[PDB]
Write an enzyme that holds these catalytic residues in place. Structure first.
Site, short mmCIF file in Angstrom:
data_model
loop_
_atom_site.label_atom_id
_atom_site.label_comp_id
_atom_site.label_asym_id
_atom_site.label_seq_id
_atom_site.Cartn_x
_atom_site.Cartn_y
_atom_site.Cartn_z
N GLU A 130 0.79 -1.18 -0.06
CA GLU A 130 0.05 -0.12 -0.19
C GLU A 130 0.80 1.29 -0.06
O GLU A 130 1.76 1.26 0.72
CB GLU A 130 -1.08 -0.13 1.21
CG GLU A 130 -2.35 -0.24 0.96
CD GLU A 130 -3.08 -0.68 2.12
OE1 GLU A 130 -2.59 -0.62 3.22
OE2 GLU A 130 -3.70 -1.90 1.94
N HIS A 157 6.18 0.53 16.78
CA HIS A 157 6.79 1.17 18.03
C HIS A 157 5.51 1.57 18.80
O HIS A 157 5.03 2.95 18.41
CB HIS A 157 7.89 2.19 17.79
CG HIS A 157 9.07 1.55 17.39
ND1 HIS A 157 10.48 2.32 17.99
CD2 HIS A 157 9.44 0.59 16.77
CE1 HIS A 157 11.45 1.68 17.47
NE2 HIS A 157 10.83 0.60 16.60
#
Lengths: 83, 87, 84, 87
Positions: B49, B86
């Site tokens: 994407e 993260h």
């Protein structure tokens, strides 16, 4: 970004579907019921959802921005990888 | 087979973490890298994407349901911004 | 709340999908034979999505919003009567 | 002419900064706050909109083309997360 009405959009639906995928455009379809909709390509829809997913946590948004900056700056690690 | 890969410093630290602690992650990452090198940035496994906003020019593929490989291809050379979410 | 139909269904069931997109906050994917598919959503949901992306697209602002919403949640706040 | 408003610390500093540097900006913010108090979160000037993702539960109105008032309404009491874009 295109603004059309219902009765136009009901006729040439396929002509508007090809126009938002190739020109990367958007269509607002207006109704008299004050219930407007927006038509975009599925590619553009999945891109925004994936972008929102990556930016949804501020530690991850920061991690991406620092990493992209490091790649542009050349503060980086290049290795041959056994794939 | 060998691919020459450019890592951001945090992406390299996460790849090294996966090498020590999660070899199934490394193998899937390596699979995505092979697919990028053969097919380009937008074709192959991992639902590739285009990304938007300040991530424009970069692409994502799914390592699993949580972790994305976030990458760009510059004259057939693969650069990795991220291979681990993260939180 | 995603709904997936094909092109010939979407031609003459256009208000049947447009109203349920706005009323139920649903979205509609319309498939294609050449697979240049489209996604239909309400104008509110589109604007909400674009506005959210605008606020997230600089990391200093995403961080500022996260820190401020956090401070509001724990009550580390300033409350004043202000002239308006 | 008075509204009891709860600020995040950064939103209050930006509001104070606007008071001693851009009174035209304070007045437009105050007009948004008055509109929120009269009409609720989703009606009135400034193109009010729900926010999504981790901003879920909050709303934005336009102060100008750049800056957004980001706020929520808790039992008619207005809380301000932001009144200034932080680049």
């Amino acid at each position: 970004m295109i603004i059309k009405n219902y009765s136009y959009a009901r006729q040439n639906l396929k002509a508007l579907m090809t126009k938002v995928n190739d020109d990367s455009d958007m269509v607002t379809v207006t109704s008299t019921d004050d219930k407007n909709v927006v038509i975009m390509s599925e590619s553009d829809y999945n891109s925004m959802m994936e972008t929102l997913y990556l930016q949804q946590n501020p530690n991850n948004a920061e991690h991406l921005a620092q990493s992209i900056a490091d790649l542009e700056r050349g503060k980086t690690i290049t290795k041959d990888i056994d794939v | 087979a060998r691919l020459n890969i450019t890592f951001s410093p945090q992406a390299f630290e996460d790849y090294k973490y996966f090498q020590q602690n999660d070899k199934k992650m490394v193998k899937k990452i390596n699979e995505l890298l092979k697919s990028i090198d053969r097919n380009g940035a937008l074709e192959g496994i991992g639902k590739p994407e285009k990304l938007k906003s300040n991530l424009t020019g970069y692409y994502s593929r799914r390592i699993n349901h949580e972790h994305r490989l976030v990458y760009t291809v510059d004259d057939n050379h693969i650069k990795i911004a991220s291979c681990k979410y993260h939180y």
